[PDB]
Short mmCIF file of C-alpha atoms in Angstrom, two decimals:
data_model
loop_
_atom_site.label_atom_id
_atom_site.label_comp_id
_atom_site.label_asym_id
_atom_site.label_seq_id
_atom_site.Cartn_x
_atom_site.Cartn_y
_atom_site.Cartn_z
CA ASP H 1 88.01 97.07 -181.86
CA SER H 2 92.11 95.38 -181.60
CA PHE H 3 92.62 91.91 -180.06
CA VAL H 4 95.10 89.66 -180.82
CA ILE H 5 94.33 86.03 -179.88
CA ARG H 6 94.92 82.18 -181.04
CA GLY H 7 93.26 81.27 -183.45
CA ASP H 8 92.12 78.24 -180.84
CA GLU H 9 89.57 80.56 -178.54
CA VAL H 10 87.82 83.37 -181.59
CA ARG H 11 84.65 80.91 -180.68
CA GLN H 12 84.24 82.50 -177.39
CA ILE H 13 84.58 85.88 -178.13
CA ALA H 14 81.00 85.49 -180.36
CA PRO H 15 77.84 86.76 -178.80
CA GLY H 16 76.31 85.07 -175.93
CA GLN H 17 79.29 82.23 -175.87
CA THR H 18 81.92 83.01 -172.33
CA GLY H 19 85.23 80.79 -171.95
CA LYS H 20 88.41 82.06 -170.48
CA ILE H 21 89.52 84.81 -172.62
CA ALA H 22 85.28 86.24 -172.98
CA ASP H 23 84.66 86.37 -169.07
CA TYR H 24 87.99 87.62 -168.52
CA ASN H 25 90.10 89.33 -171.37
CA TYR H 26 86.61 90.92 -173.38
CA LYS H 27 83.85 90.07 -173.35
CA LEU H 28 80.95 91.22 -175.76
CA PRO H 29 76.85 92.61 -175.46
CA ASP H 30 74.36 90.03 -176.42
CA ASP H 31 72.55 93.03 -178.24
CA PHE H 32 75.59 93.21 -179.69
CA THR H 33 76.05 94.59 -182.99
CA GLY H 34 79.24 94.31 -184.97
CA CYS H 35 81.33 92.21 -186.75
CA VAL H 36 83.57 89.68 -185.14
CA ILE H 37 86.94 90.03 -187.88
CA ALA H 38 89.40 87.60 -187.78
CA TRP H 39 93.17 87.11 -190.29
CA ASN H 40 96.19 84.84 -188.68
CA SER H 41 99.17 87.09 -188.27
CA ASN H 42 102.07 84.04 -187.91
CA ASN H 43 104.62 86.57 -190.40
CA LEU H 44 104.39 89.40 -187.58
CA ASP H 45 103.10 88.50 -184.88
CA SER H 46 104.07 85.78 -184.54
CA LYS H 47 108.10 85.58 -183.19
CA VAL H 48 110.80 82.86 -182.53
CA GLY H 49 111.12 81.62 -179.36
CA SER N 1 18.13 74.64 -157.66
CA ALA N 2 16.37 77.29 -156.97
CA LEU N 3 18.47 79.89 -157.31
CA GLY N 4 20.19 78.22 -159.95
CA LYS N 5 21.38 81.24 -162.29
CA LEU N 6 23.45 83.10 -159.13
CA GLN N 7 24.97 79.87 -158.35
CA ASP N 8 25.85 79.29 -161.47
CA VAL N 9 28.37 83.14 -161.88
CA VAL N 10 30.01 82.45 -159.42
CA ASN N 11 30.65 78.86 -160.16
CA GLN N 12 31.44 80.21 -163.75
CA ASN N 13 33.77 83.25 -162.73
CA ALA N 14 35.93 80.57 -159.71
CA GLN N 15 35.69 78.09 -162.44
CA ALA N 16 37.37 80.52 -165.12
CA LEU N 17 40.20 82.34 -161.85
CA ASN N 18 40.76 78.42 -160.65
CA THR N 19 42.27 77.40 -164.79
CA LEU N 20 43.67 80.89 -165.00
CA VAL N 21 45.67 79.60 -161.74
CA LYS N 22 45.99 75.59 -163.22
CA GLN N 23 47.11 77.11 -166.34
CA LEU N 24 49.63 78.85 -164.56
CA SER N 25 51.73 75.92 -163.81
CA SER N 26 51.37 75.00 -167.77
CA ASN N 27 54.93 74.57 -169.44
CA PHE N 28 53.75 75.71 -173.03
CA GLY N 29 56.79 73.57 -174.46
CA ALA N 30 59.45 75.40 -171.66
CA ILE N 31 61.83 72.96 -169.65
CA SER N 32 60.32 74.12 -166.71
CA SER N 33 57.16 75.59 -164.92
CA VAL N 34 59.12 77.52 -162.93
CA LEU N 35 61.89 80.41 -163.87
CA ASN N 36 64.23 80.11 -161.28
CA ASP N 37 65.01 76.63 -162.42
CA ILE N 38 65.27 77.80 -165.85
CA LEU N 39 67.44 80.30 -164.74
CA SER N 40 70.03 78.10 -162.10
CA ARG N 41 70.18 74.71 -164.88
CA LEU N 42 70.49 76.19 -168.20
CA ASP N 43 72.60 79.37 -169.54
CA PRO N 44 71.74 82.60 -170.48
CA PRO N 45 69.89 82.31 -174.02
CA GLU N 46 68.52 79.22 -173.98
CA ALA N 47 66.98 80.01 -171.05
CA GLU N 48 65.92 83.28 -172.06
CA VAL N 49 64.02 81.72 -175.70
#
């Protein structure tokens, strides 16, 4: 599952924590098995303005 | 003090039941002895623990 988020909200994504992103955008399961992978995409995914 | 054996058996059973009921109301290291308050105060991971 790919979702491009503010580097300030990886914390919410982690299983069992909640947040705006976690409660309303993408929720993880409590017994989730998998890898939360992230990497800053400023060169391309961010554009001026 | 002639029917001591039967009375002792009845007293032992009643004491065992009362001890079980009292032991139901033990914290065992938890925050509270009642689960509804634990669910209300805590988030799901800590409450589950």
